[PDB]
Amino acid sequence: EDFRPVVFVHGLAGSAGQFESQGMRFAANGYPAEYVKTFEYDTISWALVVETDMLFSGLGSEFGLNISQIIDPETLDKILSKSRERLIDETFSRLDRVIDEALAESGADKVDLVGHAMGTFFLVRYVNSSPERAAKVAHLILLDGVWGVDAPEGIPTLAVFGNPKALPALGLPEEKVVYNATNVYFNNMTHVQLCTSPETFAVMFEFINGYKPATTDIVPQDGDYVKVKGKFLAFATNGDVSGWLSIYPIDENGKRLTRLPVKFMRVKGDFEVRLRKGQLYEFQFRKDFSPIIYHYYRAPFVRDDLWARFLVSKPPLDVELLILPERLSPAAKETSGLLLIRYKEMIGEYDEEIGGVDEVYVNGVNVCTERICPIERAVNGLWVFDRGADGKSDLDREVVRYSIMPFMSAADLVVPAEGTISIAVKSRTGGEESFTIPAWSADRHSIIVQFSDYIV
Ligand SMILES: CCCCCCCCCCCCCCCC
Numbered sequence: 509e510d511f512r513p514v515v516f517v518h519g520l521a522g523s524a525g526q527f528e529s530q531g532m533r534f535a536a537n538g539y540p541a542e543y544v545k546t547f548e549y550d551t552i553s554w555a556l557v558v559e560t561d562m563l564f565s566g567l568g569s570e571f572g573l574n575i576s577q578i579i580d581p582e583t584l585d586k587i588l589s590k591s592r593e594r595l596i597d598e599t600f601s602r603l604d605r606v607i608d609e610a611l612a613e614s615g616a617d618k619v620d621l622v623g624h625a626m627g628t629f630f631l632v633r634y635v636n637s638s639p640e641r642a643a644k645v646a647h648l649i650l651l652d653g654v655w656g657v658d659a660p661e662g663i664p665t666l667a668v669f670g671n672p673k674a675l676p677a678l679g680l681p682e683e684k685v686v687y688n689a690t691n692v693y694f695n696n697m698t699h700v701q702l703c704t705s706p707e708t709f710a711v712m713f714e715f716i717n718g719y720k721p722a723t724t725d726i727v728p729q730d731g732d733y734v735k736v737k738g739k740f741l742a743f744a745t746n747g748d749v750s751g752w753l754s755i756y757p758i759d760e761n762g763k764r765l766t767r768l769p770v771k772f773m774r775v776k777g778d779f780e781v782r783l784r785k786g787q788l789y790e791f792q793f794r795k796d797f798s799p800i801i802y803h804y805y806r807a808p809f810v811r812d813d814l815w816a817r818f819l820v821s822k823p824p825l826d827v828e829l830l831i832l833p834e835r836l837s838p839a840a841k842e843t844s845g846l847l848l849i850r851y852k853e854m855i856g857e858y859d860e861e862i863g864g865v866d867e868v869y870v871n872g873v874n875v876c877t878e879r880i881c882p883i884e885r886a887v888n889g890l891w892v893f894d895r896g897a898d899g900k901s902d903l904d905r906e907v908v909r910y911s912i913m914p915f916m917s918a919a920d921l922v923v924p925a926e927g928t929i930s931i932a933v934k935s936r937t938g939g940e941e942s943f944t945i946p947a948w949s950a951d952r953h954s955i956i957v958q959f960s961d962y963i964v
Pocket residue numbers: 519520521522523700743819820821827828847849888889915916954956
Protein backbone atom coordinates (compact mmCIF):
# COMPACT_ATOMS: atom_id res chain seq x y z
CA GLU A 509 0.00 0.00 0.00
CA ASP A 510 1.58 3.22 1.19
CA PHE A 511 4.08 1.24 3.37
CA ARG A 512 7.94 0.82 3.18
CA PRO A 513 9.68 -2.62 3.60
CA VAL A 514 11.05 -3.62 7.03
CA VAL A 515 14.22 -5.76 7.60
CA PHE A 516 14.93 -7.61 10.95
CA VAL A 517 18.40 -8.73 12.24
CA HIS A 518 18.53 -11.30 15.11
CA GLY A 519 20.96 -11.75 18.07
CA LEU A 520 23.34 -14.46 19.40
CA ALA A 521 21.91 -17.99 18.90
CA GLY A 522 18.81 -16.43 17.19
CA SER A 523 17.08 -16.67 13.73
CA ALA A 524 14.07 -15.28 11.72
CA GLY A 525 11.88 -17.17 14.20
CA GLN A 526 11.92 -14.21 16.65
CA PHE A 527 10.11 -12.00 14.02
CA GLU A 528 7.63 -14.67 12.83
CA SER A 529 4.70 -13.40 14.99
CA GLN A 530 5.60 -9.70 14.25
CA GLY A 531 5.51 -10.42 10.48
CA MET A 532 1.98 -11.85 10.78
CA ARG A 533 0.89 -8.70 12.76
CA PHE A 534 2.28 -6.29 10.10
CA ALA A 535 0.38 -8.21 7.36
CA ALA A 536 -2.87 -8.19 9.44
CA ASN A 537 -2.60 -4.35 9.38
CA GLY A 538 -2.17 -3.97 5.60
CA TYR A 539 1.45 -4.66 4.72
CA PRO A 540 2.01 -7.04 1.72
CA ALA A 541 3.62 -10.03 3.61
CA GLU A 542 6.58 -10.07 1.25
CA TYR A 543 7.53 -6.50 2.50
CA VAL A 544 8.75 -7.98 5.82
CA LYS A 545 12.27 -9.44 5.32
CA THR A 546 14.85 -11.05 7.63
CA PHE A 547 18.68 -11.21 7.43
CA GLU A 548 20.33 -14.28 8.95
CA TYR A 549 24.06 -14.82 9.74
CA ASP A 550 26.55 -17.08 11.71
CA THR A 551 26.53 -15.66 15.29
CA ILE A 552 29.36 -17.83 16.64
CA SER A 553 31.96 -16.40 14.17
CA TRP A 554 30.49 -12.84 14.44
CA ALA A 555 30.69 -12.80 18.26
CA LEU A 556 34.24 -14.24 18.44
CA VAL A 557 35.80 -12.30 15.57
CA VAL A 558 33.94 -8.98 15.59
CA GLU A 559 32.32 -8.56 19.06
CA THR A 560 35.10 -9.96 21.27
CA ASP A 561 34.59 -6.88 23.50
CA MET A 562 30.94 -7.53 24.33
CA LEU A 563 31.63 -11.24 24.77
CA PHE A 564 34.23 -10.90 27.55
CA SER A 565 33.24 -7.47 28.84
CA GLY A 566 29.55 -7.75 29.76
CA LEU A 567 28.16 -5.50 26.97
CA GLY A 568 26.76 -8.92 26.17
CA SER A 569 26.19 -12.12 28.09
CA GLU A 570 27.75 -15.27 29.45
CA PHE A 571 28.46 -17.05 26.18
CA GLY A 572 32.05 -15.98 26.60
CA LEU A 573 32.16 -18.12 29.74
CA ASN A 574 30.95 -21.13 27.75
CA ILE A 575 32.99 -20.89 24.53
CA SER A 576 36.11 -22.77 25.55
CA GLN A 577 33.83 -25.31 27.19
CA ILE A 578 31.71 -25.95 24.10
CA ILE A 579 33.76 -25.37 20.95
CA ASP A 580 36.68 -27.65 20.16
CA PRO A 581 39.98 -25.74 20.96
CA GLU A 582 41.20 -26.37 17.39
CA THR A 583 37.99 -25.33 15.67
CA LEU A 584 38.18 -22.21 17.78
CA ASP A 585 41.64 -21.54 16.38
CA LYS A 586 40.36 -21.89 12.80
CA ILE A 587 37.53 -19.44 13.54
CA LEU A 588 39.90 -16.93 15.18
CA SER A 589 42.29 -17.01 12.21
CA LYS A 590 39.66 -15.43 9.98
CA SER A 591 40.35 -11.81 8.98
CA ARG A 592 38.10 -9.30 10.84
CA GLU A 593 37.98 -6.59 8.10
CA ARG A 594 37.19 -9.32 5.61
CA LEU A 595 34.32 -10.82 7.62
CA ILE A 596 32.82 -7.34 8.24
CA ASP A 597 33.04 -6.39 4.55
CA GLU A 598 31.57 -9.62 3.11
CA THR A 599 28.65 -9.76 5.58
CA PHE A 600 27.66 -6.09 5.13
CA SER A 601 27.75 -6.53 1.33
CA ARG A 602 25.23 -9.39 1.68
CA LEU A 603 22.83 -7.15 3.72
CA ASP A 604 23.25 -4.50 0.95
CA ARG A 605 21.81 -6.98 -1.56
CA VAL A 606 18.83 -7.79 0.66
CA ILE A 607 18.02 -4.06 1.04
CA ASP A 608 18.46 -3.26 -2.70
CA GLU A 609 16.13 -6.15 -3.66
CA ALA A 610 13.40 -4.92 -1.21
CA LEU A 611 13.63 -1.39 -2.69
CA ALA A 612 13.35 -2.71 -6.32
CA GLU A 613 10.39 -4.93 -5.44
CA SER A 614 8.39 -2.18 -3.64
CA GLY A 615 9.39 0.97 -5.46
CA ALA A 616 10.33 2.60 -2.11
CA ASP A 617 13.40 4.86 -1.72
CA LYS A 618 14.27 3.77 1.88
CA VAL A 619 13.64 0.87 4.31
CA ASP A 620 13.04 0.54 8.10
CA LEU A 621 15.65 -1.57 10.09
CA VAL A 622 15.01 -3.48 13.37
CA GLY A 623 17.64 -5.28 15.52
CA HIS A 624 17.43 -7.48 18.71
CA ALA A 625 20.28 -7.92 21.24
CA MET A 626 23.59 -8.57 19.41
CA GLY A 627 21.76 -7.53 16.22
CA THR A 628 21.65 -3.91 17.56
CA PHE A 629 25.53 -3.81 17.72
CA PHE A 630 25.56 -5.21 14.15
CA LEU A 631 23.21 -2.53 12.80
CA VAL A 632 24.80 0.54 14.49
CA ARG A 633 28.16 -0.45 12.87
CA TYR A 634 26.42 -1.12 9.50
CA VAL A 635 24.62 2.30 9.32
CA ASN A 636 27.80 4.12 10.49
CA SER A 637 30.01 2.38 7.85
CA SER A 638 29.18 4.69 4.86
CA PRO A 639 26.95 7.66 3.82
CA GLU A 640 25.62 5.56 0.95
CA ARG A 641 24.27 2.86 3.28
CA ALA A 642 22.65 5.34 5.72
CA ALA A 643 20.92 7.23 2.93
CA LYS A 644 18.71 4.20 2.34
CA VAL A 645 17.36 4.06 5.99
CA ALA A 646 14.14 5.86 7.11
CA HIS A 647 14.02 4.59 10.78
CA LEU A 648 16.25 2.42 13.09
CA ILE A 649 14.73 0.42 16.03
CA LEU A 650 17.06 -1.10 18.71
CA LEU A 651 15.47 -3.82 20.92
CA ASP A 652 17.01 -4.69 24.34
CA GLY A 653 20.63 -4.49 23.21
CA VAL A 654 23.35 -1.83 23.14
CA TRP A 655 23.29 1.35 25.31
CA GLY A 656 25.67 4.18 26.19
CA VAL A 657 26.44 5.10 22.54
CA ASP A 658 25.21 7.79 20.04
CA ALA A 659 22.34 7.02 17.64
CA PRO A 660 23.66 7.20 14.04
CA GLU A 661 23.83 10.75 12.64
CA GLY A 662 20.62 11.94 10.99
CA ILE A 663 18.57 8.69 11.27
CA PRO A 664 15.44 8.70 13.61
CA THR A 665 16.16 5.97 16.17
CA LEU A 666 13.99 4.24 18.86
CA ALA A 667 15.53 2.13 21.67
CA VAL A 668 13.27 -0.18 23.82
CA PHE A 669 14.57 -1.82 27.07
CA GLY A 670 13.15 -4.65 29.27
CA ASN A 671 13.48 -5.88 32.88
CA PRO A 672 17.13 -5.66 34.01
CA LYS A 673 16.93 -8.62 36.47
CA ALA A 674 15.93 -10.61 33.36
CA LEU A 675 19.48 -11.88 32.88
CA PRO A 676 22.90 -10.87 34.32
CA ALA A 677 21.72 -7.41 35.53
CA LEU A 678 25.15 -6.97 37.14
CA GLY A 679 25.33 -3.79 35.07
CA LEU A 680 23.08 -0.74 34.64
CA PRO A 681 19.67 -1.20 36.39
CA GLU A 682 16.57 0.28 34.69
CA GLU A 683 18.74 3.11 33.32
CA LYS A 684 20.03 2.33 29.85
CA VAL A 685 19.98 5.15 27.29
CA VAL A 686 21.02 5.58 23.62
CA TYR A 687 22.07 9.24 23.04
CA ASN A 688 19.85 11.33 20.73
CA ALA A 689 17.28 8.49 20.36
CA THR A 690 13.72 8.22 21.68
CA ASN A 691 14.12 5.76 24.67
CA VAL A 692 11.20 3.84 26.35
CA TYR A 693 10.86 1.02 28.94
CA PHE A 694 8.81 -2.20 29.55
CA ASN A 695 9.89 -3.31 33.04
CA ASN A 696 7.46 -6.29 33.08
CA MET A 697 9.16 -8.13 30.10
CA THR A 698 12.05 -10.60 29.85
CA HIS A 699 14.70 -10.62 27.00
CA VAL A 700 13.23 -12.65 24.07
CA GLN A 701 9.63 -11.91 25.23
CA LEU A 702 10.30 -8.17 24.47
CA CYS A 703 11.22 -9.02 20.88
CA THR A 704 7.99 -11.04 20.17
CA SER A 705 5.38 -9.15 22.28
CA PRO A 706 2.19 -7.53 20.89
CA GLU A 707 2.90 -4.39 23.00
CA THR A 708 6.34 -4.00 21.35
CA PHE A 709 4.61 -4.36 17.95
CA ALA A 710 2.22 -1.43 18.70
CA VAL A 711 5.18 0.79 19.70
CA MET A 712 7.28 -0.04 16.55
CA PHE A 713 4.27 0.44 14.19
CA GLU A 714 3.43 3.88 15.60
CA PHE A 715 7.14 5.01 15.46
CA ILE A 716 7.43 4.22 11.76
CA ASN A 717 3.89 4.99 10.50
CA GLY A 718 2.55 7.81 12.75
CA TYR A 719 -0.67 6.15 13.98
CA LYS A 720 -1.79 3.31 16.26
CA PRO A 721 -2.48 -0.01 14.49
CA ALA A 722 -6.16 -1.08 14.39
CA THR A 723 -5.21 -4.51 15.82
CA THR A 724 -2.26 -6.35 17.53
CA ASP A 725 -3.93 -9.83 17.13
CA ILE A 726 -2.89 -12.57 14.71
CA VAL A 727 -6.05 -12.35 12.56
CA PRO A 728 -7.07 -15.56 10.66
CA GLN A 729 -7.52 -14.82 6.96
CA ASP A 730 -10.49 -15.86 4.79
CA GLY A 731 -10.14 -18.85 2.50
CA ASP A 732 -9.42 -22.56 2.94
CA TYR A 733 -5.65 -22.44 2.27
CA VAL A 734 -2.45 -20.71 3.52
CA LYS A 735 0.96 -20.16 1.89
CA VAL A 736 3.94 -21.30 4.05
CA LYS A 737 7.64 -20.41 3.31
CA GLY A 738 10.17 -21.96 5.76
CA LYS A 739 13.76 -23.19 6.16
CA PHE A 740 15.65 -26.06 7.88
CA LEU A 741 18.92 -24.54 9.25
CA ALA A 742 21.70 -25.12 11.79
CA PHE A 743 21.21 -23.81 15.35
CA ALA A 744 23.33 -20.69 16.02
CA THR A 745 25.55 -20.91 12.93
CA ASN A 746 22.44 -20.78 10.61
CA GLY A 747 23.70 -22.57 7.50
CA ASP A 748 21.25 -24.37 5.13
CA VAL A 749 20.54 -28.05 6.05
CA SER A 750 19.77 -30.79 3.44
CA GLY A 751 17.23 -33.66 3.87
CA TRP A 752 13.77 -35.22 3.18
CA LEU A 753 10.42 -33.73 4.41
CA SER A 754 7.08 -35.65 4.79
CA ILE A 755 3.97 -33.63 5.95
CA TYR A 756 0.92 -35.44 7.43
CA PRO A 757 -2.43 -33.99 8.60
CA ILE A 758 -3.16 -35.47 12.14
CA ASP A 759 -6.19 -35.94 14.48
CA GLU A 760 -6.68 -34.77 18.12
CA ASN A 761 -4.51 -37.66 19.44
CA GLY A 762 -1.73 -37.19 16.89
CA LYS A 763 -2.69 -40.13 14.67
CA ARG A 764 -1.92 -39.66 10.89
CA LEU A 765 -5.16 -39.17 8.87
CA THR A 766 -3.67 -40.22 5.50
CA ARG A 767 -1.88 -43.30 4.18
CA LEU A 768 0.74 -41.36 2.25
CA PRO A 769 2.06 -37.85 3.13
CA VAL A 770 0.11 -34.91 1.64
CA LYS A 771 3.43 -33.30 0.66
CA PHE A 772 6.83 -35.06 0.15
CA MET A 773 10.01 -33.21 -0.90
CA ARG A 774 13.81 -33.04 -0.97
CA VAL A 775 14.81 -29.85 0.91
CA LYS A 776 18.05 -27.87 0.70
CA GLY A 777 17.52 -25.04 3.20
CA ASP A 778 14.41 -23.06 2.06
CA PHE A 779 11.08 -24.66 1.01
CA GLU A 780 7.54 -23.43 0.08
CA VAL A 781 4.19 -25.31 0.33
CA ARG A 782 0.39 -24.69 0.26
CA LEU A 783 -1.49 -26.11 3.33
CA ARG A 784 -5.01 -26.03 4.93
CA LYS A 785 -5.89 -23.16 7.31
CA GLY A 786 -6.63 -24.32 10.86
CA GLN A 787 -5.45 -27.93 10.36
CA LEU A 788 -3.04 -29.71 12.78
CA TYR A 789 0.09 -31.22 11.06
CA GLU A 790 3.18 -33.36 11.83
CA PHE A 791 6.41 -32.30 9.92
CA GLN A 792 8.67 -35.47 9.72
CA PHE A 793 12.29 -34.79 8.61
CA ARG A 794 15.33 -37.08 8.01
CA LYS A 795 18.63 -35.11 7.75
CA ASP A 796 21.43 -36.28 5.44
CA PHE A 797 23.92 -38.63 7.09
CA SER A 798 21.89 -39.46 10.20
CA PRO A 799 19.44 -42.31 10.63
CA ILE A 800 17.38 -40.54 13.37
CA ILE A 801 13.77 -39.61 12.44
CA TYR A 802 12.66 -36.11 13.63
CA HIS A 803 8.98 -35.17 14.27
CA TYR A 804 8.18 -31.39 14.66
CA TYR A 805 4.78 -30.24 16.10
CA ARG A 806 3.17 -26.76 16.49
CA ALA A 807 -0.27 -25.01 16.47
CA PRO A 808 -2.16 -24.77 13.11
CA PHE A 809 -1.37 -21.89 10.68
CA VAL A 810 -4.30 -19.32 10.58
CA ARG A 811 -2.81 -16.99 7.96
CA ASP A 812 0.16 -17.01 5.49
CA ASP A 813 3.57 -17.46 7.28
CA LEU A 814 6.71 -16.62 5.32
CA TRP A 815 9.16 -16.91 8.29
CA ALA A 816 8.88 -20.47 9.73
CA ARG A 817 12.10 -22.02 11.08
CA PHE A 818 12.97 -25.69 11.92
CA LEU A 819 16.25 -25.85 13.95
CA VAL A 820 18.75 -28.74 13.37
CA SER A 821 21.84 -29.67 15.50
CA LYS A 822 25.21 -29.53 13.58
CA PRO A 823 28.99 -29.18 14.29
CA PRO A 824 30.75 -27.20 15.63
CA LEU A 825 27.91 -26.75 18.13
CA ASP A 826 26.24 -30.14 18.10
CA VAL A 827 24.09 -29.71 21.25
CA GLU A 828 22.06 -32.84 20.48
CA LEU A 829 25.02 -35.21 21.11
CA LEU A 830 24.82 -34.26 24.80
CA ILE A 831 21.94 -36.77 24.84
CA LEU A 832 23.73 -39.63 22.96
CA PRO A 833 24.68 -41.81 25.95
CA GLU A 834 21.01 -42.27 26.82
CA ARG A 835 19.94 -42.71 23.13
CA LEU A 836 22.44 -45.62 22.92
CA SER A 837 21.13 -47.50 25.97
CA PRO A 838 18.83 -50.57 25.79
CA ALA A 839 16.38 -48.54 27.89
CA ALA A 840 15.98 -46.09 24.96
CA LYS A 841 13.59 -48.49 23.20
CA GLU A 842 11.30 -47.96 26.23
CA THR A 843 11.14 -44.15 26.72
CA SER A 844 10.74 -40.91 24.71
CA GLY A 845 12.95 -37.82 24.46
CA LEU A 846 11.60 -34.34 23.74
CA LEU A 847 12.58 -30.67 23.31
CA LEU A 848 9.99 -27.96 24.17
CA ILE A 849 10.54 -24.47 22.58
CA ARG A 850 8.93 -21.03 23.28
CA TYR A 851 10.30 -17.62 22.14
CA LYS A 852 9.12 -16.07 25.47
CA GLU A 853 11.04 -17.18 28.60
CA MET A 854 9.52 -20.06 30.62
CA ILE A 855 9.82 -19.02 34.31
CA GLY A 856 9.28 -21.20 37.35
CA GLU A 857 10.62 -18.76 39.98
CA TYR A 858 8.16 -16.13 41.25
CA ASP A 859 8.92 -12.41 40.86
CA GLU A 860 6.80 -9.27 41.34
CA GLU A 861 8.10 -7.04 38.49
CA ILE A 862 7.53 -9.95 36.08
CA GLY A 863 4.40 -10.69 38.10
CA GLY A 864 3.79 -14.37 37.25
CA VAL A 865 5.05 -17.96 36.85
CA ASP A 866 4.46 -20.37 33.89
CA GLU A 867 3.38 -24.07 34.44
CA VAL A 868 4.41 -26.75 31.83
CA TYR A 869 2.92 -30.28 32.34
CA VAL A 870 4.20 -33.49 30.63
CA ASN A 871 1.91 -36.52 31.38
CA GLY A 872 0.72 -34.42 34.38
CA VAL A 873 4.11 -33.56 35.92
CA ASN A 874 5.10 -29.83 36.04
CA VAL A 875 8.66 -29.51 34.64
CA CYS A 876 8.86 -25.66 34.91
CA THR A 877 10.05 -25.61 38.57
CA GLU A 878 11.99 -22.91 40.49
CA ARG A 879 15.04 -25.15 40.19
CA ILE A 880 14.82 -26.14 36.51
CA CYS A 881 13.63 -22.79 35.10
CA PRO A 882 14.98 -19.95 37.33
CA ILE A 883 14.76 -16.34 36.00
CA GLU A 884 18.54 -16.09 35.36
CA ARG A 885 18.57 -19.07 32.94
CA ALA A 886 16.06 -17.35 30.54
CA VAL A 887 14.80 -20.71 29.26
CA ASN A 888 13.54 -20.77 25.62
CA GLY A 889 14.44 -24.45 25.03
CA LEU A 890 13.70 -27.22 27.62
CA TRP A 891 15.02 -30.81 27.16
CA VAL A 892 12.86 -33.60 28.78
CA PHE A 893 14.31 -37.18 28.91
CA ASP A 894 15.44 -39.96 31.35
CA ARG A 895 18.87 -38.70 32.51
CA GLY A 896 21.07 -41.72 33.27
CA ALA A 897 18.65 -44.13 31.51
CA ASP A 898 17.88 -45.61 34.97
CA GLY A 899 14.05 -45.65 34.92
CA LYS A 900 13.87 -43.03 37.66
CA SER A 901 12.37 -39.52 37.45
CA ASP A 902 14.72 -37.50 39.76
CA LEU A 903 13.36 -33.97 39.09
CA ASP A 904 15.25 -32.41 41.98
CA ARG A 905 18.75 -33.40 40.78
CA GLU A 906 19.79 -30.88 38.08
CA VAL A 907 21.05 -32.20 34.72
CA VAL A 908 24.55 -30.63 34.91
CA ARG A 909 25.56 -31.01 31.22
CA TYR A 910 23.08 -28.27 30.14
CA SER A 911 24.22 -25.71 32.71
CA ILE A 912 26.72 -24.51 30.09
CA MET A 913 24.22 -23.97 27.20
CA PRO A 914 22.72 -20.47 26.58
CA PHE A 915 18.88 -20.11 26.90
CA MET A 916 18.43 -23.85 27.69
CA SER A 917 17.71 -26.17 30.66
CA ALA A 918 16.67 -29.82 31.16
CA ALA A 919 14.36 -32.06 33.29
CA ASP A 920 14.93 -35.74 34.32
CA LEU A 921 11.45 -37.27 33.58
CA VAL A 922 10.62 -40.86 32.50
CA VAL A 923 8.11 -40.67 29.59
CA PRO A 924 6.99 -44.24 28.61
CA ALA A 925 7.14 -45.00 24.89
CA GLU A 926 3.61 -46.45 24.68
CA GLY A 927 0.42 -44.75 23.57
CA THR A 928 0.51 -40.93 23.64
CA ILE A 929 2.20 -38.06 25.47
CA SER A 930 0.07 -35.21 26.94
CA ILE A 931 1.65 -31.67 27.00
CA ALA A 932 0.02 -28.53 28.49
CA VAL A 933 1.13 -24.98 29.19
CA LYS A 934 -0.51 -22.34 31.44
CA SER A 935 1.11 -18.95 30.60
CA ARG A 936 2.29 -16.37 33.13
CA THR A 937 0.52 -13.75 31.07
CA GLY A 938 -2.74 -15.77 30.98
CA GLY A 939 -4.41 -18.45 28.85
CA GLU A 940 -3.43 -22.04 27.95
CA GLU A 941 -2.33 -24.36 25.09
CA SER A 942 -2.25 -28.21 24.92
CA PHE A 943 -0.99 -31.02 22.66
CA THR A 944 -1.44 -34.83 22.46
CA ILE A 945 1.12 -36.69 20.23
CA PRO A 946 2.44 -40.29 19.71
CA ALA A 947 5.05 -41.47 22.28
CA TRP A 948 7.86 -42.19 19.71
CA SER A 949 10.81 -44.21 21.16
CA ALA A 950 14.18 -42.45 21.72
CA ASP A 951 16.43 -45.12 20.20
CA ARG A 952 15.25 -44.12 16.67
CA HIS A 953 13.12 -40.92 17.05
CA SER A 954 13.46 -37.28 18.28
CA ILE A 955 10.44 -35.06 19.19
CA ILE A 956 10.28 -31.21 18.98
CA VAL A 957 7.13 -29.26 20.16
CA GLN A 958 6.93 -25.47 19.65
CA PHE A 959 4.50 -23.51 21.89
CA SER A 960 2.94 -20.32 20.51
CA ASP A 961 4.66 -17.20 21.83
CA TYR A 962 1.44 -15.29 22.60
CA ILE A 963 -2.01 -16.62 23.61
CA VAL A 964 -4.94 -14.14 23.63
C1 LIG B 1 17.48 -15.69 21.45
C2 LIG B 1 16.98 -16.98 20.80
C3 LIG B 1 17.05 -18.17 21.76
C4 LIG B 1 16.69 -19.46 21.03
C5 LIG B 1 16.73 -20.67 21.97
C6 LIG B 1 16.53 -21.97 21.20
C7 LIG B 1 16.51 -23.19 22.14
C8 LIG B 1 16.41 -24.49 21.35
C9 LIG B 1 17.75 -24.94 20.76
C10 LIG B 1 17.55 -26.08 19.75
C11 LIG B 1 18.88 -26.71 19.33
C12 LIG B 1 18.71 -27.64 18.13
C13 LIG B 1 17.69 -28.76 18.37
C14 LIG B 1 17.60 -29.67 17.14
C15 LIG B 1 16.51 -30.73 17.26
C16 LIG B 1 16.80 -31.74 18.37
